[PDB]
DNA sequence: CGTCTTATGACAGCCGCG
DNA sequence: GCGGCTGTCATAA
C-alpha cells in the first residue's frame, strides 16, 4: 500500500517521476514542482525556519524551478546567502516521501543485457556504431526471462537459427553447456534483417522499460552502441525512445588524463555492474573482463572457442549466441553472491536519492543531513566555494624491522564515527577554540586540561556537550547497522571452522545438508549432527556458510566506507559541510587516541610482568596496537603448554580478562581528560599469532610501515581449523605482482613463520628450478595504462617513460599495419614481460591487454625472447631479499666452514 | 557519479660523480 | 655502479 519512487528526473520547469503506487503498479507523473529556498531575516520576523547556527530564515516559494535557480545567482551577485536544497529532485523526494521508505524489489524492474557486434575493422567504437548489432540478450527481473534477439542475416554472413536443444547439451556431446536452471527461462526470437531486430527490440523496451539498467560495461559500451546504431538508422527521435520521457543527453566524462562520452537515459537509473564491483568489492583486480571476474567470483570460467571473435559468428553461430546468453547470467550469479544491486537500493531509498547517486557519498550525505534537518524545520547552509588545501591524517608507528614470535593485536571499532560521536563533532556544535599544547603533552597527560564545560580535540577545537549533533546523530544510525552485519559475518566464519573441522574425519552416509541460519552460532545439538555427516552435505554446508560470510562482509564494508566517507567529505571542498577544523579535529584525536593507549598498554604490561621500561607495542596504524607477547609466554614458560591451541587459549583469556579492562579504563581516563560527551573508544582483540609449538618458525615479521606478516590462529573470535597467514602490504597482496609469484612468495612466508629457515631454503631451491616451466601469464607483472599518449613520441619511448608504458609502445609497433589485433586501452590494465637483448621487438619489455592471451601473430616470439633471469630477480628474489633481510634470515644457504666436509647420507 | 580522506611503501627513469 | 630526486602505481588505514 505504501508507495515509493523508482526514478526521478528534472527537465525544464517540470519533475518527471516514475513510481510504484498503492496497488503495486508502475506509473508516471509530470509534477510542476514549486520549490522553496530561504534567506536570513531580522529578529522581528518570528517564523518556524532557522539555519543550523540558529539565525532566523524567511521562506521563498517560487512559481517554477527556473525562477528558484535564477534567484540563487542574483543572490550571489549581491553577497547574500541563498539557503535551502538547490537540487530540486532531492527536494521533491523529501516532500513526496516524508517517511521511512519501505520498498518491494519484485516490483522494481531490474534489467541487464549485452550486445554482440562482428567487427573486422577492430573495436566497434560506440560513438560511431559502424557495424550491425547481430545479437542482444536481455534479462528482465519481473518476468525472470532471458530474451534473445538474434540476427540471422548481415553483410558478414547468413546464419542458421540457434538451437536451445544443442545449447543445453554438454560440451563433450557437441553442446554449449548453458546452465540448466536458465534453460526453461529463455525466450528465443530470430530476425531476418537488422532493422526488424532493432525495431522489435524498441517495442520490447517500451513495454518493459528498465528501472535499473545494469550489466558488464553497459554504460561504457552497450547503451552508447544501441543508442547510436538506432540513431544512425532511424533518426534521433527514435533513439530517444530508450528514455521513458524521450530525453537523452551525451555526457562528457573528463578526468586527469583524457575524456569519454556516455549517454544519459532520463528516467532510467544506470548501475553498470563493473562500477558496483570496483566500488563495493574492495579487491583490486589484474583484469576487469567478465571472464576474469567470473572465474574469480564463481570459479567457473567460460568454454573456449576456435579462432578470433570477429570470425566466430561465421564459423560457429551456435556458440556465438550461447556465450552472449551465459555472459548475461554471469552478472546475475555475481550479484546473487555479492548483492550489490540490493545494497544500492537499500542505500538509495534510505538516503532518498536517485539510485545511481550511491556512487556519490557526498550526494548521499548531503541528502541524509538535509532530510534530518528538514524534519526539525531547519535550513541547510548554502554550498560555498573553497580552495583545495592539505590537512593531517593518521599516526603510524615506525616499527623496528625484525622477526616477532608471539603477537597479539587490538583495534578500535569504527574509529572515526566513534570519535565524531564521542566528541560531538558537527558544523553547528562548534563552541570555539583553546590555546593548544604540542601533541606529545596530551599523550602523556602533562598539558593543561582543555575545558570543564566543552568537549575538545587536541587540534584546539571545542564542542557543546549538552546539545545533540546532526552528524553524530545520523552516523549513529549507521554504526549499529554495521555491528549487526559484522556479527553475522563473524558467526558464519566461526560456523565455517566447525564444518572444516568435521571435514577432517567425515562419515559416508547418503544424507542431505542441514537447514540452518548460518548468521548465528551453532547450538550443541546441531554440532553433533555435523560430526556424523557426509562430505557431500558438509561441502554444501560450507559453501553456504561462506556465501553468508561474503553477504555479511559486503554489507558491513559498505557501511564502514560510507561512514568514513562522511569524515572524508568533511575534507572535501564541494561538501556542503566542508570544514578543516572538523576534519582535523577528528584525525588529531585519533593520533592521540592511539599513542595514549600505547603508553597505557606499555605501563600495564610492565607492572604485570614484573619489569619496567620495556616496549610491548611494536607497531600501530591509525587505530591499532600490535603487542609483543614473548614476555607474557616466557613468564609462564611455554614448557607448560601441551599443544598450540593451549597457548592460544591463554592469550585470549589474558586479553579479555586482563588487557581489555585495563584498556577500557585507559580510554575512560582520556574521555575525562578531553571532557567528552560520551565514552566510545572500544578496542576489539584481533589476531593471536605465533609459531606452532615445538617447531622452528618465526611466527611473524615486519619490514616497515604498512608491511608485515603474521601466523594467525585466532582472528577476532574465530578459531581456525588450520592456521591462517595475515599478510599486509607485502608483494603477495598487490595486484601488480605476478600470479605465480604471489603464490610462491606466500609459501616462502608460510615456511618462514610455520617451519623456519631450513624449510624456506628448501623451497627457494625447488621454485628456482621450476620457474622457467610456468605459464607466461602466471609470471607476468600487471600495471595500469595511464598517459600512454603523453610518453608516445612518434612510436618510440619519450623522456621519463614508465616501464609498463614502454612495454605498450613496443606492443603497438609489433602489431602495427595488421588490420586488427587487440589494442591497449587508456586507463586499463596490462600484463608486462621483460625481453632479452637483441630481440625482434624495439626495446627491453613488452605489454598487452590484461586478462587475455597475446595475439597468436606475435606470441611465439614473445615466449622465445622472455627474460626469465630478469623476471625472476625483479618479481621474486628482490621481494624475498626484503622479507628475509627484515626477519634476519637467509633464503640461500651461506658459506660455512662445514662446506669442507663430505655429507652424503 | 564522474564532488569521501591521508599515510606510506616499492620501483624505475634520470642525473650526477675525476 | 649507488644514491638522491621525481613520477607512477600500489596498498593500509
Ligand atoms: Mg558479451
Ligand atoms: Mg578500527
Ligand atoms: Mg584499524
Which residue's CA lies closest to nucleotide B6 at its C1' atom?
Answer: A393
Whether residue A100 is found in the same domain as residue A143: no
DSSP string, A790-823: HHEETTEE-TT--HHHHHHHHHHHHTTTSS---P
Going by C-alpha positions, the residue among A780, A701, A773, A706 that lies closest to residue A739 is A780
**A376 close to A48: Cβ distance less than 8 angstroms:** no
Across A396-439, the runs of DSSP E, i.e. the strands, are 402-403, 407-412, 430-433
Calpha distance A770→A633 (Å, rounded): 41
Q: Is the CB of A234 under 7 A from strand B?
A: no
Whether residue A176 is found in the same domain as residue A138: yes
Torsion region of A246: left, alpha or beta (phi above 0 gives left; psi -120 to 50 gives alpha): left
Strands across the sheet containing A829-834: A781-784, A829-834, A845-849
* Structural domain span for residue A810: 775-866
Discontinuities in chain A with C to N beyond 2.5 Å fall right after: none
**A150 close to A161: Cβ distance less than 8 angstroms:** yes
Whether residue A114 is found in the same domain as residue A125: yes
Eight-class DSSP state of A160: P
- Length A799 CA → B18 C1' (Å): 28
How many Cα neighbours within 13 Å face the side chain of A316? 17
Position A858 in a domain: yes
Expressed in angstroms and rounded, the spacing between residue A411 Cα and the centre of ligand 3 is: 5
Torsion angle (degrees, nearest 10) of CA A225, A228, A229, A230 = 120
Residue listed under C-alpha cell 562482428:
A118
Position A740 in a domain: yes
Calpha distance A191→A436 (Å, rounded): 76
Axis-axis angle for helices A194-207, A223-233 (nearest 10): 120
Nucleotide nearest to A272 (CA to C1'): B1
End-to-end CA gap in chain A: 84
Whether residue A709 is found in the same domain as residue A601: yes
Q: How far is CA A837 from CA A228, A300, A482, A834, A866, in A?
A: 47, 40, 56, 10, 10
Whether residue A347 is found in the same domain as residue A483: no
Residue listed under C-alpha cell 614484573:
A610
Q: How far is CA A38 from CA A31, A71, A771, in A?
A: 22, 11, 70
Expressed in angstroms and rounded, the spacing between residue A576 Cα and the centre of ligand 2 is: 27
Residues with CB under 5 A from ligand 3 (ion): A 411, 622-624
Residue A738 main-chain phi, psi, to 5 deg: -55, 140
Helical (H) or strand (E) element with A378 = strand A378-379
Whether residue A395 is found in the same domain as residue A500: no
Q: Is the CB of A272 under 7 A from strand B?
A: yes
Going by C-alpha positions, the residue among A147, A158, A161, A145 that lies closest to residue A114 is A147
Going by C-alpha positions, the residue among A83, A89, A92, A88 that lies closest to residue A52 is A83
**A768 close to A815: Cβ distance less than 8 angstroms:** no
Which residue's CA lies closest to nucleotide B14 at its C1' atom?
Answer: A800
Of A704, A729, A754, which residue constitutes the final position of a domain? A729
Strand-strand pairing, A829-834 and A845-849:
antiparallel
Calpha distance A31→A9 (Å, rounded): 10
Calpha distance A352→A713 (Å, rounded): 44
**A609 close to A659: Cβ distance less than 8 angstroms:** no
Position A634 in a domain: yes
**A5 close to A18: Cβ distance less than 8 angstroms:** yes
Protein-covered nucleotides on strand B (Cβ within 7 A): 1-15
Query: Which 3 state secondary structure label does DSSP give A434?
Result: coil
Whether residue A397 is found in the same domain as residue A357: no
Axis-axis angle for helices A340-351, A361-375 (nearest 10): 40
Going by C-alpha positions, the residue among A322, A116, A331 that lies closest to residue A229 is A116
Whether residue A103 is found in the same domain as residue A119: no
Calpha distance A786→A891 (Å, rounded): 36
Q: Which ligand is nearest to the CA of A412?
A: 2
Residue A9 main-chain phi, psi, to 5 deg: -150, 135
3-state secondary structure A458-492: CCCEEEECCCCCHHHHHHHHHHHHHHHHHHHHHHH
Nucleotide nearest to A729 (CA to C1'): C11
Whether residue A444 is found in the same domain as residue A498: no
A554-583 residues near strand B (Cβ < 7 Å): 561, 564-565, 567-569, 571-572, 574
**A472 close to A582: Cβ distance less than 8 angstroms:** no
Protein-covered nucleotides on strand C (Cβ within 7 A): 7-13
Q: List, in order, residues 6 or more apart from A822 with CB less than 8 Å away.
A: A848, A849, A852, A855
Expressed in angstroms and rounded, the spacing between residue A115 Cα and the centre of ligand 1 is: 6
Going by C-alpha positions, the residue among A683, A684, A682, A658 that lies closest to residue A605 is A658
Bridge partners (DSSP) of residue A449 are none
Calpha distance A553→A482 (Å, rounded): 10
Calpha distance A815→A824 (Å, rounded): 11
Query: Which 3 state secondary structure label does DSSP give A577?
Result: coil
Strands across the sheet containing A454-456: A430-433, A461-464, A454-456
Position A896 in a domain: no
Calpha distance A721→A502 (Å, rounded): 10
Strands across the sheet containing A26-31: A4-11, A14-20, A26-31
Position A277 in a domain: yes
**A833 close to A780: Cβ distance less than 8 angstroms:** yes
Expressed in angstroms and rounded, the spacing between residue A412 Cα and the centre of ligand 2 is: 4
3-state secondary structure A777-791: CCCCEEEECCCHHHH
Cell numbers given for A251 = 555526457
Q: Which ligand is nearest to the CA of A221?
A: 1
Bridge partners (DSSP) of residue A133 are A117
- Length A402 CA → B14 C1' (Å): 33
Q: What angle do CA A12, A16, A20 make, to 5 degrees?
A: 170
Going by C-alpha positions, the residue among A20, A91, A97, A89 that lies closest to residue A356 is A89
Calpha distance A29→A8 (Å, rounded): 10
Whether residue A157 is found in the same domain as residue A297: yes
Going by C-alpha positions, the residue among A763, A758, A762 that lies closest to residue A746 is A763
Tell me, rounded to whole angstroms, the distance of Cα A503 from its chain centroid.
Answer: 32
CATH number, residue A844? 3.40.1820.10
CATH number, residue A757? 1.20.1280.300
Query: Which 3 state secondary structure label does DSSP give A39?
Result: strand
Position A203 in a domain: yes
Query: Which 3 state secondary structure label does DSSP give A691?
Result: coil
Calpha distance A176→A304 (Å, rounded): 10
Calpha distance A325→A146 (Å, rounded): 8
Query: Which 3 state secondary structure label does DSSP give A631?
Result: helix
Calpha distance A841→A861 (Å, rounded): 9
Position A375 in a domain: yes
- Length A600 CA → B2 C1' (Å): 45
Nucleotide nearest to A564 (CA to C1'): B4
Calpha distance A493→A819 (Å, rounded): 52
CATH number, residue A424? 3.90.1600.10
Position A410 in a domain: yes
Radius of gyration, CA atoms only, chain A:
31
Residue A233 main-chain phi, psi, to 5 deg: -95, -45
Query: Which 3 state secondary structure label does DSSP give A847?
Result: strand
- Length A846 CA → B14 C1' (Å): 22
Residue A480 main-chain phi, psi, to 5 deg: -65, -30
Query: Which 3 state secondary structure label does DSSP give A209?
Result: coil
Q: List, in order, residues 6 or more apart from A77 with CB less than 8 Å away.
A: none
For chain A, helix (H) and strand (E) counts, in that order, are 28, 33
Q: For residues A34-51, b (16+ Cβ closer than 10 Å) or e, as one string?
A: bbbbbbeeeeeeeeebbb
Q: Which ligand is nearest to the CA of A114?
A: 1
Calpha distance A891→A889 (Å, rounded): 7
Q: For residues A364-397, b (16+ Cβ closer than 10 Å) or e, as one string?
A: bbbbbbbbebbeeebbbbbbeeeeeeeeeeebeb
Residue A54 main-chain phi, psi, to 5 deg: 110, -15
Tell me, rounded to whole angstroms, the distance of Cα A38 from its chain centroid.
Answer: 39
Expressed in angstroms and rounded, the spacing between residue A715 Cα and the centre of ligand 3 is: 14
Calpha distance A749→A723 (Å, rounded): 13
Nucleotide nearest to A879 (CA to C1'): B10
Resolution in A: 2.7
Q: For residues A772-796, b (16+ Cβ closer than 10 Å) or e, as one string?
A: eebebbebbbbbbbbbbeebbeeee
**A442 close to A488: Cβ distance less than 8 angstroms:** no
CATH number, residue A508? 1.10.287.690
Going by C-alpha positions, the residue among A363, A200, A354, A144 that lies closest to residue A268 is A354
Of A518, A550, A572, which residue constitutes the final position of a domain? A572
Torsion region of A787: left, alpha or beta (phi above 0 gives left; psi -120 to 50 gives alpha): left
Q: How far is CA A546 from CA A403, A494, A518, A534, in A?
A: 33, 10, 9, 18
**A578 close to A511: Cβ distance less than 8 angstroms:** no
Calpha distance A94→A510 (Å, rounded): 57
Whether residue A706 is found in the same domain as residue A752: no
DSSP string, A682-720: -EEEEEEE-PPTTS----EEEEETTEEEEEEEEETTEEE
**A264 close to A248: Cβ distance less than 8 angstroms:** yes
Eight-class DSSP state of A892: S
Q: How many domains does chain A have?
A: 6
Whether residue A724 is found in the same domain as residue A621: yes
**A367 close to A348: Cβ distance less than 8 angstroms:** no
Q: What angle do CA A71, A74, A79 make, to 5 degrees?
A: 120
Amino acid at each position: 500500500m505504501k508507495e515509493f519512487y523508482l526514478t526521478v528526473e528534472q527537465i525544464g520547469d517540470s519533475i518527471f517521476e516514475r513510481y510504484i503506487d498503492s496497488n503495486g503498479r508502475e506509473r508516471t507523473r509530470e509534477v510542476e514542482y514549486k520549490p522553496s529556498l530561504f534567506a536570513h531575516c531580522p529578529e522581528s520576523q518570528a517564523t518556524k525556519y532557522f539555519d543550523i547556527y540558529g539565525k532566523p530564515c524567511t521562506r521563498k516559494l517560487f512559481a517554477n524551478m527556473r525562477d528558484a535557480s535564477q534567484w540563487i545567482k542574483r543572490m550571489e551577485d549581491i553577497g547574500l546567502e541563498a539557503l535551502g536544497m538547490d537540487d530540486f529532485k532531492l527536494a521533491y523526494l523529501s516532500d513526496t516521501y516524508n517517511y521511512e521508505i519501505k520498498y518491494d524489489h519484485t516490483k522494481i524492474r531490474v534489467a541487464n543485457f549485452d550486445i554482440e557486434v562482428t567487427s573486422p575493422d577492430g573495436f566497434p567504437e560506440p560513438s560511431q556504431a559502424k557495424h550491425p548489432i547481430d545479437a542482444i540478450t536481455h534479462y528482465d527481473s519481473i518476468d525472470d526471462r532471458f530474451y534473445v534477439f538474434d540476427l540471422l542475416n548481415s553483410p558478414y554472413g547468413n546464419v542458421e537459427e540457434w538451437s536451445i536443444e544443442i545449447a543445453a547439451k554438454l560440451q563433450e556431446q557437441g553442446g554449449d553447456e548453458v546452465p540448466s536452471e536458465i534453460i526453461d527461462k529463455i525466450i528465443y526470437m530470430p530476425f531476418d534483417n537488422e532493422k526488424e531486430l532493432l525495431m522489435e527490440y524498441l517495442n520490447f523496451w517500451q513495454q518493459k522499460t528498465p528501472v535499473i539498467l545494469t550489466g558488464w560495461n553497459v554504460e561504457s559500451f552497450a547503451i552508447p552502441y544501441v543508442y547510436n546504431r538506432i540513431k544512425n538508422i532511424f533518426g534521433e527521435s527514435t533513439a530517444k525512445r530508450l528514455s521513458p520521457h524521450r530525453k537523452t543527453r551525451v555526457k562528457v566524462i573528463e578526468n586527469m588524463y583524457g575524456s569519454r562520452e556516455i549517454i544519459t537515459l532520463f528516467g532510467i537509473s544506470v548501475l553498470d555492474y563493473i562500477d558496483l564491483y570496483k566500488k563495493f568489492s574492495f579487491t583490486n583486480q589484474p583484469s576487469y573482463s567478465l571472464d576474469y571476474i567470473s572465474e574469480f567470483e564463481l570459479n567457473v570460467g567460460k568454454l573456449k572457442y576456435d579462432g578470433p571473435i570477429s570470425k566466430l559468428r561465421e564459423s560457429n553461430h551456435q556458440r556465438y549466441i550461447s556465450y552472449n546468453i551465459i555472459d548475461v547470467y554471469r552478472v546475475l550469479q555475481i550479484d546473487a553472491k555479492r548483492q550489490f544491486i540490493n545494497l544500492s537500493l537499500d542505500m538509495g531509498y534510505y538516503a532518498k536519492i536517485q539510485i545511481q547517486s550511491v556512487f556519490s557519498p557526498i550526494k548521499t550525505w548531503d541528502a541524509i543531513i538535509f532530510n534530518s534537518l528538514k524534519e526539525q524545520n531547519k535550513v541547510i547552509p548554502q554550498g560555498r566555494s573553497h580552495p583545495v588545501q592539505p590537512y593531517p591524517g593518521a599516526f603510524v608507528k615506525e616499527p623496528i624491522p625484525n622477526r616477532y614470535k608471539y603477537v597479539m593485536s587490538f583495534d578500535l571499532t569504527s574509529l572515526y564515527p566513534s570519535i565524531i560521536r564521542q566528541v560531538n563533532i558537527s558544523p553547528e556544535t562548534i563552541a570555539g577554540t583553546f590555546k593548544v599544547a604540542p601533541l606529545h603533552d596530551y599523550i602523556n597527560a602533562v598539558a593543561e586540561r582543555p575545558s570543564d564545560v566543552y568537549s575538545c580535540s587536541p587540534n584546539g577545537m571545542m564542542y557543546y556537550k549538552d546539545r545533540d549533533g546532526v552528524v553524530p546523530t545520523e552516523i549513529t544510525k549507521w554504526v549499529s547497522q554495521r555491528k549487526e552485519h559484522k556479527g553475522y559475518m563473524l558467526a558464519a566464519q566461526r560456523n565455517g571452522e566447525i564444518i572444516k573441522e568435521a571435514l577432517h574425519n567425515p562419515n559416508l552416509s547418503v544424507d542431505e545438508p542441514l537447514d540452518v541460519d548460518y548468521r548465528f552460532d551453532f547450538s550443541d545439538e546441531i554440532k553433533e549432527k555435523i560430526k556424523k555427516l557426509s562430505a557431500k552435505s558438509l561441502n554444501e554446508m560450507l559453501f553456504r556458510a561462506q556465501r553468508t560470510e561474503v553477504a555479511g562482509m559486503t554489507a558491513q564494508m559498505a557501511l564502514k566506507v560510507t561512514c568514513n566517507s562522511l569524515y572524508g567529505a568533511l575534507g572535501n571542498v564541494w561538501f556542503r559541510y566542508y570544514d578543516l577544523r572538523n576534519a582535523t579535529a577528528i584525525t588529531t584525536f585519533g593520533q592521540m587516541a592511539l599513542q595514549w593507549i600505547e603508553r597505557k598498554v606499555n605501563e600495564y604490561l610492565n607492572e604485570v610482568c614484573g619489569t619496567e621500561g620495556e616496549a610491548f607495542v611494536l607497531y600501530g596504524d591509525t587505530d591499532s596496537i600490535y603487542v609483543s607477547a614473548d614476555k607474557i609466554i616466557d613468564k609462564v614458560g611455554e614448557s607448560k603448554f601441551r599443544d598450540t591451541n593451549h597457548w592460544v587459549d591463554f592469550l585470549d583469556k589474558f586479553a579479555r580478562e586482563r588487557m581489555e579492562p585495563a584498556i577500557d579504563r585507559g580510554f575512560r581516563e582520556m574521555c575525562e581528560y578531553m571532557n567528552n560527551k560520551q565514552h566510545l573508544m572500544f578496542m576489539d582483540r584481533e589476531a593471536i599469532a605465533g609459531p606452532p609449538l615445538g617447531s622452528k618458525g618465526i611466527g611473524g615479521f615486519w619490514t616497515g610501515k604498512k608491511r608485515y606478516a603474521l601466523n594467525v590462529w585466532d582472528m577476532e573470535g574465530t578459531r581456525y581449523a588450520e592456521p591462517k597467514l595475515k599478510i599486509m602490504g607485502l608483494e603477495t597482496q598487490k595486484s601488480s605482482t605476478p600470479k605465480a609469484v604471489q603464490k610462491a612468495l606466500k609459501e616462502c612466508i608460510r615456511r618462514m613463520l610455520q617451519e623456519g629457515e631450513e624449510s624456506l631454503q628448501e623451497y627457494f631451491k625447488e621454485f628456482e628450478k621450476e620457474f622457467r616451466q610456468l605459464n607466461y601469464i602466471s609470471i607476468a607483472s600487471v600495471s595500469s595504462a595511464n598517459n600512454i599518449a603523453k610518453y608516445d613520441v612518434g612510436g618510440f619511448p619519450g623522456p621519463k617513460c614508465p616501464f609498463h608504458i614502454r612495454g605498450i609502445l613496443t606492443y603497438n609497433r609489433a602489431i602495427k599495419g595488421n588490420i586488427d589485433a587487440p589494442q591497449v586501452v587508456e586507463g586499463e590494465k596490462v600484463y608486462v614481460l621483460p625481453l632479452r637483448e637483441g630481440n625482434p621487438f624495439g626495446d627491453k619489455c613488452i605489454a598487452w591487454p590484461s586478462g587475455t592471451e597475446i595475439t597468436d601473430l606475435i606470441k611465439d616470439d614473445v615466449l622465445h625472447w622472455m627474460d626469465y633471469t630478469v623476471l625472476l630477480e625483479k618479481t621474486f628474489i628482490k621481494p624475498l631479499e626484503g622479507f628475509t633481510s627484515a626477519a634476519k634470515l637467509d633464503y640461500e644457504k651461506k658459506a660455512s666452514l662445514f662446506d669442507m666436509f663430505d655429507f652424503s647420507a
